[PDB]
């Protein structure tokens, strides 16, 4: 119903100004844009726009009734607004929205399989053992029916037989199969799990509901549960507390060696 690109090519969910400008400058072209929900004033939105001379402007968008208001103008949807300033009128004098910048969506391009049965390896061979439900990255498949894989739960690498696995859909999060990752539970259930089953210094990671591409590290202190934001960069890394990491696993190792909260280290993920 609009001339805008699909929403997932420019909508970043809840995002602060600093990260939004980082993503626009990573994009690099004048006319690049994104829309975010204000982190500081939730329920209101921001059109962030890379102008000439590396300047990023930010335009507030107010959600009034079932519509969106910018500069006093009314739009039925964010898509209509983007279509308007891409193809109908200019946003700044002589400048229009040109290049949507997509949020860093996690993608797994490698083939994955899932164990339908447990398996105990033959000792002193290249086989690896696994539990029912283990997920694997397939690196290659041999014509014996065997595959060279990495088990995501254990990180062991070796041979398994295709008769004991099924295919995994491309849609599943790349962290599926990690022992600390829960890709299906709700925020409420993560809190409940850490309170009932988890112990002090237990933790888990799940995707953010409000920011596409983000993850949340849930951590249990003696008194409460704290949530920390992990944010991807456009450069295949992850950011937490302004520190940069090659993987979420690296974040977990870091906070096993350094205190995440004064007087606390990560101990064990809550069992799954």
């Amino acid at each position: 119903g609009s001339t805008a690109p699909p929403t997932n090519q420019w909508y970043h969910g809840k995002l602060d100004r600093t990260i939004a400008e980082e993503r626009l400058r990573q994009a690099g072209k004048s006319g690049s844009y994104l829309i975010r929900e204000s982190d500081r004033r939730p329920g209101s939105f921001v059109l962030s726009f890379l102008s000439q001379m590396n300047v990023v402007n930010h335009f507030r968008i107010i959600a009034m009734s079932g519509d969106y208001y910018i500069g006093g103008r009314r739009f039925s949807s964010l898509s209509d607004l983007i279509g308007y300033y891409s193809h109908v009128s200019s946003l700044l004098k002589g400048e229009k929205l040109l290049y949507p910048v997509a949020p860093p969506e996690p993608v797994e391009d490698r083939r994955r399989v899932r164990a339908i049965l447990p398996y105990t390896k033959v000792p002193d061979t290249d086989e690896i053992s696994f539990l029912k439900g283990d997920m694997f990255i397939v690196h290659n498949e041999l014509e014996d029916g065997w595959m060279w894989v990495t088990n995501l739960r254990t990180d062991e690498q070796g041979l398994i037989v295709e008769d004991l696995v099924e295919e995994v859909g491309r849609e599943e999060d790349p962290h599926e199969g990690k022992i600390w990752f829960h890709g299906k539970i709700s925020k409420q259930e993560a809190y409940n799990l850490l309170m009932t089953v988890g112990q002090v210094s237990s933790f888990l990671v799940r995707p953010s509901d409000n920011t596409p591409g983000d993850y949340s590290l849930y951590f249990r202190t003696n008194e409460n549960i704290q949530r920390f934001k992990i944010s991807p960069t456009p450069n295949n890394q992850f950011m937490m507390g302004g520190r940069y990491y090659n993987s979420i696993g690296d974040i977990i190792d870091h906070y096993r060696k350094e205190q995440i909260v004064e007087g606390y280290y990560l101990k064990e993920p809550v069992p799954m």
Binding site: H58, G71, L91, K93, G241, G242, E258, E262
Partner: peptide
């Protein structure tokens, strides 16, 4: 209800009242 910052967080904050928002042409 808010996200927390870790003990070694290195985020240097900026005040919202200083952030300038603009209006379309």
């Amino acid at each position: 209800s808010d996200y927390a910052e870790p003990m070694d967080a290195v985020v240097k904050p900026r005040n919202e009242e200083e952030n300038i928002y603009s209006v379309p042409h």
